Symmetry: C3
């Protein structure tokens, strides 16, 4: 079991689904969908899209994270958990994982897909212009770089606390063709889990 993370809009789910393809024993589950479910279950009027959950107070937001972690420890087959290491809120960065949730999921490792902010912006803005996932953030190149290095710091903290590996997958290099990052990362991860 491994947690798989990246900045929003850089191709985290695409990699997850290609993995689910090339493997039969493993599942893929999006922690974000579960969080959305519980969040709208208790605050259906302020929550309308996924990003809205970031505006929630700390106490309620913690409750939602803890509830959402419940439906993943239900999974027993090898699993990859699509989630975030930190979330950009009006108040700053908020940890995607908190001791309760880490001890519930008990991940064997974390995987960080790190991109060049140019590509991330390109993908976010292409989806936005095409009327899809319109609600991601319009961030600067600098803001996205900051988000990524902060993701890294959070990951290392979690690892220091919980005996999990920290794998950094470098996708900063320029791509010859589309989804080259995706295939490369999928190949690296297949190599990892087969041992």
């Amino acid at each position: 079991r491994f947690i798989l993370t990246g900045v929003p809009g850089a191709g985290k789910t695409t990699v997850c689904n290609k993995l689910a393809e090339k493997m039969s024993n493993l599942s893929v589950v999006n922690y974000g969908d579960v969080i959305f479910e519980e969040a709208k279950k208790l605050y259906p009027s302020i929550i309308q899209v996924r990003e809205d959950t970031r505006k929630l107070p700390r106490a309620d937001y913690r409750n939602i994270q803890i509830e959402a972690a419940k439906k993943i420890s239900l999974i027993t087959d090898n699993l990859i958990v699509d989630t975030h290491m930190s979330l950009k809120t009006p108040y700053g960065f908020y940890p995607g994982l908190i001791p309760e949730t880490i001890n519930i999921i008990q991940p064997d490792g974390i995987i960080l897909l790190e991109f060049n902010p140019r590509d991330v912006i390109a993908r976010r803005e292409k989806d936005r212009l095409a009327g899809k996932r319109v609600t991601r953030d319009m961030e600067s190149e600098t803001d996205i770089l900051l988000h990524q290095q902060v993701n890294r710091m959070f990951a290392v903290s979690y690892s220091a606390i919980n005996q999990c590996y920290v794998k950094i997958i470098d996708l900063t290099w320029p791509q010859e063709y589309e989804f080259q990052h995706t295939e490369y990362a999928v190949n690296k991860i297949i190599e990892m889990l087969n041992f």
Copy 2:
């Protein structure tokens, strides 16, 4: 409840005072000054300047941190705590926050004012030339960048541990007028407190 910090001599304080002015609902309190006073009240022969507070053994230093944190953990609706995230000691960096003081102060988040070392050196040496706070360390640009990055890493670790926010306010950009930095910061902080 937010802790407000920055490297020495970048203006952490000045920002706090203008906040206390520009908002009426909030109260601002200088945790660092209280630590200074406690330390030289209890060890008057070792501590004469503020930097002397950094050579204390960790056990005694911790006891003083906790004593000062009790005098300052208020129950106002909004509270900003002026302090440091890390301290340069002869033995390395020492955390400005510890689990005990976090549990006392109950902070919702940490706020890091990040400056460009050029401005920091400017302000430090300007005060030093005018006989103000002469004990401030004479540091290279690289030393100051290191101090800021280590502050960031501390903030992230505590956040992961205590489910708090980490807000990074970038003030490396050029300022048309002196203190432009300050107002920018103040404004964003108010935007945070009002939500």
Copy 3:
């Protein structure tokens, strides 16, 4: 006092440890890796010549208790992380820090070029720059995490500068460290 001493591989960590042990009689230097090797050889009479990770952690704990027992100033040569096919794994686990009760961590931070040179030098007589810098930043973050949980010092010793003569880094680091132990 008690300090952990850590840095990227093959860059002169043990040379510094030995010169340290020399220039000071009051100090003790110990290699955590050797201690875990010894413990493993002693608890399982044959499995170990170069294990479940529960047992692995238990022997890490045993070695840490052996090191908890030295009286005087202590410097513990070990690593903040190890590069595995699955990613970086922390050298240290919370219980190890609670056992050793270190006053501080010291990170010897090098320039990847010199690291590569020293490595290949050892190779001829029996990683890229980016890989080495990543490992260094990760070590730094691990150190600050351990400090955040146990309130120990985090010292960064900069040895990225060019050497006037070889082993200058070594005596520089020893000078800084000796200056620390004497306060």
